[PDB]
Design a protein around this ligand. Structure first.
Ligand SMILES: [Ca+2]
Length: 697
């Protein structure tokens, strides 16, 4: 599906808008918070909010503003646009010439020509939203399409007439649209299924034609409704964070087409928030994250999307393994029935049967509609990803132990998984017969070009575990020491290269951080997801190598991370006992692999850090959960659990939910609660054998 290339719809944060700039040279002025545009929460075309553009264009002064396109992982396919559409509202009547000049800033920081905004404003009456359409043509833009649209970095704004007066205009729904607006033959209300209240929020969900968005209406009395949110068609769900307990709200949803016609109302649903215990909070968090892998699954495969909003069709195989485990948990927790689960797993297993194999391994990314590998990370990564394969198969072997009933469907699930599992040629990923290491990747056409050795401490322990547990194409248990825990010079250098410290370059570490002596681990543990991914199924309580027991050591990493965060050397806003777990996520412009280390901390906290650490640091993780939900939920709690990351220091929250990050929360919560996934995985015969073999060295 194509996205609209949107510069602004709504700020997920209050106050100011991360993806904007506003600056000035006195005697001119533009209102800004840390050179970001203010977010007006009291006026909006698409509810939530709009951007406030309050300025003084004074003779001899200047101001500049821009609204920056927010890149989102996998947001690569867009409608071919012809127009820059905005909604513009003037607070006061004004000379139209005092309105801003407008341009588009390219990715290289050159600009289009500036146009007077007055020329696209039929009506300059204040206190009403005016649709504006600027043909891209008028900026002197040639044909815009997927190959070049991302060079349209920002909508730039400059003074009109320097008349020296203060004007406030509001800008909303700044986006590129096609010349021909998508239309719909009929514009029907979605079926609004229910409202589900929790403590601070109500979740509504509906079932759906190329509409623009759903508009959500809320009433506190059932009589008068106000528009509270919009949801794009890729989200059939809305999370209304009331922030208030015992609060009744009624909800009504309409569908809006690109012409901004509105369907009739859905049925009205209501719910009332109520106080929640920690148990209820765990349930809710597990459930919301589960949604990502259930209703949020790529529908053909049943598997986990890399991210939402992201590629519609691309599944991530590692995240899918995590999600598989989230789904098993979700069945046990009664979020879905076993039969629903079974149906999903029949689809999952049939799809994985058909997916491209690379010596039995899977690629990182697969197109869920075709089974074909997607070279999402570049043309070299177009074949097997053994680590992702291991994450997938950690999930599948867990599922295989779960679906143990003697019926034809669970038999088929089991059959399929056993065969998929047996046929992962782990040994192939040695590259050489005598390689001390597994390799991360193998390309069908470029062979070992990426050439990344699997060297711990990092996230890849389960890759070695599963490689060694593989019943047909297993590798020697010695590979755990020669590869994963390699003492070679090269492996030492590899560790120090990413770690930027010498600590843990010997696999073993032995240094103390925040009073915790870390037996194993690069630096003070690396991104905290290192103690999650390989330990969703592999029970770290039940694996001990010659250096350490892993629950003990992993738990130290969690505590170290929390203690770093409490200490908060960086002075980052909101870090503390209830806000910790530095780990990898997308941030504003790029991926970052954050750690409890100054050079890998910039104020960005991914909730998955603390939350998937539950089994290790339950109280600390429960504190995080409570904080994230009750204090930060207005921006941080969403339809698929917590947003991927947030940075209170720069006033940013992630626009996405990440396949990698949501399931660990469900799964590790579950392992803390019942040991479910651990017990499942650890009961697998091949798993037991491999562990025995490794521990007997
Ligand atoms: Ca808006």
């Amino acid at each position: 599906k194509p996205y609209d290339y949107v510069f602004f719809e709504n700020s997920l944060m209050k106050g100011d808008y991360f993806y904007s700039q506003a600056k000035y040279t006195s005697p001119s002025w533009i209102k800004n918070a840390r050179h970001h545009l203010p977010v007006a929460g009291s006026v909006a075309f698409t509810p939530g909010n709009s951007l406030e553009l309050t300025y003084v264009s004074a003779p001899g002064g200047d101001w500049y503003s821009e609204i920056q396109y927010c890149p989102v992982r996998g947001n690569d396919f867009f409608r071919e646009p012809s127009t820059l559409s905005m909604q513009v509202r003037l607070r006061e009547s004004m000379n139209a010439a005092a309105l801003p000049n407008i341009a588009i800033r390219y990715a290289d920081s050159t600009y289009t020509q500036y146009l007077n905004l007055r020329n696209y404003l039929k009506d300059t009456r204040p206190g009403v939203w005016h649709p504006v359409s600027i043909p891209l043509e008028d900026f002197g833009l040639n044909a815009v399409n997927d190959t070049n649209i991302k060079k349209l970095a920002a909508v730039a704004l400059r003074p009109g007439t320097a008349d020296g007066n203060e004007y406030t205009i509001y800008l909303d729904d700044i986006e590129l649209l096609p010349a021909s607006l998508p239309s719909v033959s009929a514009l029907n209300a979605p079926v609004l299924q229910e409202a589900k209240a929790y403590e601070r929020h109500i979740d509504i969900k509906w079932i759906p034609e190329d509409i623009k968005y759903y508009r959500i209406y809320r009433s506190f009395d059932g009589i008068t409704y106000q528009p509270v949110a919009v949801r794009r068609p890729w989200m059939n769900r809305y999370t209304d964070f009331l922030g208030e307990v015992g609060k009744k709200a009624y909800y009504k949803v309409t569908a809006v087409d690109y012409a901004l016609n509105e369907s009739n109302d859905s049925q009205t649903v209501s719910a009332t928030t109520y106080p929640m215990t920690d148990e209820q909070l765990l349930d809710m968090v597990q459930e919301a994250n589960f949604r990502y892998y259930w209703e949020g699954a790529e529908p053909n495969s049943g598997l986990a999307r890399e991210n939402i909003p992201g590629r519609n069709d691309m599944i991530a195989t590692g995240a899918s393994g995590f999600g598989i485990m989230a789904i098993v948990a979700g069945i046990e927790r009664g979020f879905i029935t076993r039969e629903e689960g079974v149906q999903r797993f029949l689809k999952i297993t049939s799809f994985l049967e058909k997916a491209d194999k690379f010596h039995g391994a899977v690629s990182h990314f697969i197109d869920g509609t075709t089974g074909k590998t997607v070279a999402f990370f570049g043309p070299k990564d177009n074949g097997g990803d053994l680590v992702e394969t291991s994450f997938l198969f950690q999930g599948l072997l867990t599922a295989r132990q779960y679906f143990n009933q003697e019926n034809d469907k669970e038999k088929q699930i089991r059959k399929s998984i056993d065969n998929l599992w047996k046929n992962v040629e782990w040994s192939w990923y040695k590259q050489f017969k005598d390689s001390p290491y597994l390799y991360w990747h193998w390309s069908p056409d470029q062979a070992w070009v990426i050439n990344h050795k699997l060297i711990g401490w990092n996230e890849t322990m389960i890759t070695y575990m599963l490689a060694i547990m593989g019943p047909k194409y297993g590798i020697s248990p010695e590979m755990y020491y020669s590869g994963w825990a390699s003492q070679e010079e090269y492996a030492q250098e590899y560790r120090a290269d990413w770690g930027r410290v010498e600590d843990g370059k010997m696999y073993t570490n032995g240094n103390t951080y925040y009073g915790e002596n870390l037996k194993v681990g690069v630096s003070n543990g690396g991104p905290l997801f290192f103690i999650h991914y390989s330990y969703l199924g592999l029970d770290p309580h039940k694996f001990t190598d010659k250096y350490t027991n892993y629950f003990e050591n992993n738990q130290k990493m969690a505590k170290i991370n929390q203690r770093y965060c409490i200490e908060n050397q960086g002075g980052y806003v909101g870090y503390g006992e209830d806000c910790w777990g530095l780990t990898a996520s997308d941030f504003a412009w790029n991926y970052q692999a954050q750690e409890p280390m100054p050079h890998r901390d910039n104020g960005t906290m991914a909730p998955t850090g603390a939350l998937a650490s539950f089994p290790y640091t339950p109280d600390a993780s429960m504190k995080a959960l409570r904080n994230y939900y009750r204090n930060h939920g207005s921006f941080l709690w969403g339809e698929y659990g917590f947003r991927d990351a947030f940075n209170l220091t720069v006033n940013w929250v992630s626009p996405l939910f990440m396949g990698l990050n949501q399931a660990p929360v469900t799964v590790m919560i579950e392992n803390y609660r019942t040991n479910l996934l651990w017990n499942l995985f650890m009961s697998h015969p091949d798993v037991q054998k491999g562990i025995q073999k490794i521990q007997s060295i």
